[PDB]
Structure 1
Amino acid sequence: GIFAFENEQSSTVAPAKLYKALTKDSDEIVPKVIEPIQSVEIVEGNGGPGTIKKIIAIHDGHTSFVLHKLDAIDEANLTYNYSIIGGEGLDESLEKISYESKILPGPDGGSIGKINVKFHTKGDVLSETVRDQAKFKGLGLFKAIEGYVLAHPDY
């Protein structure tokens, strides 16, 4: 099954600066802002599209990871497409979750993040808890990275 969602967030951070934090600097920022995330390591590729990363965290007192794939990036247009494709951190009911993100100009020099999310389910139902847990992880990452930029504009 495929379940699609759209989400929009406003930010006071300027678009290029927000995009940079959420892309170029994300691997450095994420362990600093999400306590359970220990490290991010590239396991395939060189950093360009097709690159797979392992995001290593502690869960229930043990190591765990998810696999993140970079699908596409278009820096001039502030777009970034990626997928969560495996690991213990991806719910067993899901083949993957695909994301297509954009950062747009917002009022007063700020930005609007828009994301399109597709849950690829192994069966034909998407658990509300599975959906909501994924939302909170992703939106939590967005807000924690934005919060870091807001706290540390000269990072």
Structure 2
Amino acid sequence: GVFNYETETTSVIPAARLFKAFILDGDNLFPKVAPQAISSVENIEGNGGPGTIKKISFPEGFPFKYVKDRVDEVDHTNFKYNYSVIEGGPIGDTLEKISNEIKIVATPDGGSILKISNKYHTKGDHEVKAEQVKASKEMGETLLRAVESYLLAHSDAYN
């Protein structure tokens, strides 16, 4: 079955720039700005569009060793990015996939709002716990804040 979770968060960075950095250049930025959260990102197959597979490794001591994520869609006009967790970590006999959608929207103050949906696809019917969703949110927020801090400090990056 599918369990749907939605959240929203804000950024002080304008949408297009935040999209170029946090979404389009995450493979590079995440291990650089948040090494305590992401040890490395490996491109396994594909050139960045639908179907591209990445292996994201976590630091020692984390609950999981890695996940493989697959790019589902990338909308460079409307700042939408869809990707799925397809192997590793929580994926296995109870959880087939996590499908995610991120949309970044401009706000008139010059920042942005990120709208995030996480859909957990379980085998038949087993149950997703608030704890697993929380952990995802916390990771996403750590990464956002680390990227935001970098973009604040490096004005010539991603313009």
TM-score by length of 2: 0.85
**Correspondence for 1:137 among 118, 123, 139:** 139
**CA distance in structure 2 between the partners assigned to 1:94 and 1:81 by the alignment:** 18
Alignment CA distance shift 1:120-1:138 (3 Å): farther
1:113 and 2:119 are equivalent in the alignment: no
Structure 2: segments with no counterpart, 5+ residues: none
- Contact 1:70–1:82 (CA under 8 A) maintained in structure 2: yes
Distance 1:68 1:91 in 2: 11
| Displacement of 1:18 | 0.6
Q: Is the 8 A contact 1:91 1:130 kept in 2?
A: no
Corresponding position of 1:9? 9
Q: Secondary structure at the match of 2:142?
A: helix
Q: How far apart are the structure 2 equivalents of 1:59 and 1:90?
A: 16
1:67-106 → structure 2 map (5 Å cutoff): 67-87=68-88, 89-90=89-90, 92=92, 93-106=94-107
Q: CA deviation at 1:50?
A: 0.5
User: Residue 45 of structure 2 aligns with which residue?
Assistant: 44
State the secondary structure of the residue aligned to 2:58: strand
1:29 corresponds to: 29
Q: Give the aligned residue type for 1:148.
A: Y
Cα root mean square deviation, aligned: 2.0
- CA shift at 1:118, angstroms? 0.8
Show CA shifts across 1:78-116 (max 9, x none).
Answer: 1111111111x3355422211111111113111111111
List gaps (5 residues or longer) in structure 1.
none
Stretches of 4+ aligned residues off by more than 4 angstroms: none
Name the structure 2 match of 1:59. Answer: 60
Aligned identity (percent) is 46
CA separation in 2, counterparts of 1:140 and 1:30?
Answer: 10
Kindly indicate whether the alpha-carbon contact (under 8 Å) linking 2:12 and 2:148 is maintained by their aligned counterparts in 1: no
Count of residues in Structure 1 that have an aligned counterpart in Structure 2: 153
Q: Is the 8 A contact 2:41 2:54 kept in 1?
A: yes
